[model samples]
Target: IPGISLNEDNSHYFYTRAGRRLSAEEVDSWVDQYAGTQVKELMLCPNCMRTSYASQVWDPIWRGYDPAGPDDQPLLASLPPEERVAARGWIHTAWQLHQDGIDIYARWIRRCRQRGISPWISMRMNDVHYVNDERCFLHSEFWRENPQLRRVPYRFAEWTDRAFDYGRAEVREHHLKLIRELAARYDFDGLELDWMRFGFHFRPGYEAEGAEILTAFTAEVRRLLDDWEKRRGHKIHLGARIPSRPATALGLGMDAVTWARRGLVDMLVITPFWASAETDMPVEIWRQLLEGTGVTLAAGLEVLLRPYPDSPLFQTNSLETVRGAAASLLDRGAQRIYLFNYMDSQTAMEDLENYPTLLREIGSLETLAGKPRRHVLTFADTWAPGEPRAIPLPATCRPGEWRAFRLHTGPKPEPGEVIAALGIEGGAIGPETLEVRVNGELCAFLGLVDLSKPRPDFPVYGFSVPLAAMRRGYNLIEVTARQELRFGWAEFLIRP
Candidate 1:
């Protein structure tokens, strides 16, 4: 089955409301957001790993000591000089809920089951969101107390100095404390180890040893789940969300392939995480690896577009493009597709209404039929800090020379409406100077330009194509420059 799932950061709903009192129904709205969709499971995340860790809210020490002022909601303007204290209010509000005798984890889990979707508690294994500034509320007590257990790196924007190394016994031992409390407290169907939340677990050059330490950690987690099964008299499974490539996963001590062979994980989420979704994820390699292991491989789709650094809003993934990615993975034999950071929109973002349409359309191949699709060459799906994902755009071709860029078209096109588009960073390009092809079929320039995602210096050029040129898999887009120009971007749009 082509399964659809969501990962909610868990604090967004609370952050939206400030510190005001929340009724059960108001809290239940979080689950209602995805109530009727085809999303099979919602991995509701409690917190980013270890910044105020311990999502199990039984003891008050893990939470707040602040006095109650129910009407006194936290204002963002008042929170930080550094503005890194943003999540403090969210965490405090969560602690307040526990004080009010409301268990959000249990409530959301029950509400998810009531809505006919499975609920799994998601734990970001090695997140580095607000760790850059330790004074922020996102930093946990454990991380603050023990600098020795942290992964020391040369340098990074996220400050890898704060990341907990799995090589430390104290780190892994304390890590399971939350699991012990959560697995025993809530009736969640499963737990997802979200390794890709930042995906840096070991010290530099120490991932080889981190691999063995993490495998033992997986075994311990499996043992805990085994005990939970007996207590609840129901079957429970474990899942691990790792990077896209097997080599990268193993490099980070996320030996997901070995975990599946040892019966450690029931679901495996291959994700791009905070990075852009690459059209080429080498799906067949993972498919062949997990075939006989009885594990479900769910390809992940992130919201970040390729080269989104240029203009985040303009480069954001539209519903059409998301459909294209989902279909591409399913075409490549992915058992299911998972969405990461797709629904956490706060503004009147583009394609807001299209999300419902996407949920409805992407559940099955039949539903996806006749829908418009867009495909493009995106950045590397996953890369660690101190490494580059290697941007493929903005490439220059010498005069009179042709270059080929390959992109996947996942599902077959519906015919009669195929178009090729690319952006050139030259002042102005003419038909004689710029030539484009789709699968080697020459295209006639439509004389139209797309300004929605326009480059600062130029507009995107559109070209008409023959219906027979589209392929169900990868297609080669050949471009030749009669004059010197920088090919900034490339895409194919299938208008149904």
Candidate 2:
């Protein structure tokens, strides 16, 4: 508790993967030398304690094992010899190389404390054992050993064939024990129970019941942290990562309302599970849920930009895209911004030096109001992309039924030229047949998109929006098609 006092209400947080290639000294240097002003807290993932580098089980591949490692070594001895051999690995060899590598959690805590940065551990609730590969590096040994505890495969979009069953009391207790041990061992500031890693928790029909179970689990964690505070003379905060959409979160058994009401979480991290960076989340919905509750809301932006093959530019999102997203989140009443999986490049030290400078500008609330901005909207009938068959937005259309979509434009729109367009890919219907309206006024159809040359399969339709038609707050878009329209992806772009 030295360099800068970590306000319970800070604006920016960075999550570093535990398996990342940076030393404790290097992490300390980055915070002290470069990111002191930007990153208020550093949440270092401890990975799965039952497997990966912090375990005691021996692996034939890495030819490494620590009988005295932080994980449960006695349980490994009880398992069948072959199962034990297949499941163990020192995947986090870098952690083992440091002085407290064997006890990596403690080392990270010490390093963050030295730099006066609040340290947290991001623990995956239940990661997949193996989706397609036979030899997964981070496969959990405990999950493999207790096959009875594994969840029955649930089909949502693709297939969650190898997810853990949190419905089982034994499985819940197993993860709880790992959490308890982590709190008991390390002197970290908080823990983020990451449920978005694989995004499945309970059986399909048992979601409601599973939500109750998860709430109880969080209550227990709260109790444990309170006990730790009394004993250790310091407070330990608890955070939970859930999906941005309420429907998706509830389906996955993340009852955030109950968690907030019960005072079980300090921070609510909202994010999309996969695909490109979901810049347009229902942030106002979350604000309404957490209203009057002391719990902080943060937007978790995962850095994975999908390739837009149909576009003429065919470009992915850059660092500027991240800034725009962060500005939007903060504008929509998010208290903080949480960065996930940002460690794509190997030049971490150099990259981190200028990281705070960018965050300082973009994360500011001043940039939101009275600014000309570009808004992007993406829609799909299904949860995933890259399938054999493609579906269109709104799914179905009737003669008189109006399909409406809304986007938040924040407060006080600066009057300027307003242009709106929609990207259509693999649609059977003609662009002329579709009608578009913004705030109840007709938008003139501006023909096909920029595709080097236009083809029948792909077309982009541009529209004209008057400045008077746009609102300072949420704007309504109503679309009606004369004939049925089907497309793989429908992206709407607005510039004001």
- Best candidate according to TM-score: 1
Candidates in order have lDDT scores of 0.73, 0.58
Candidate 2 off by > 4 Å: 1-24, 30-38, 49-92, 95-108, 111-116, 153-159, 305-316, 344-358, 368-373, 379-405, 427-436, 442-461, 479-496
lDDT for each residue of candidate 2 in 388-421, tens digit (9 for 90 to 100): 3222232355555566656555443455655554
| Candidate 1 per-residue C-alpha lDDT over 347-367 given as tens digits, one digit per residue, 9 for 90 to 100 | 222567777777766656677
Q: How many residue pairs clash (N, CA or C atoms closer than 3 angstroms) in each of the candidate models, in the order given?
A: 2, 1
TM-score of each: 0.90, 0.72
Model 1 has an lDDT value of 0.73
Model 1, position 484, has a per-residue lDDT of 78
- Off by more than 4 A, model 1: 49-89, 153-157, 308-315, 347-349, 384-390, 451-457
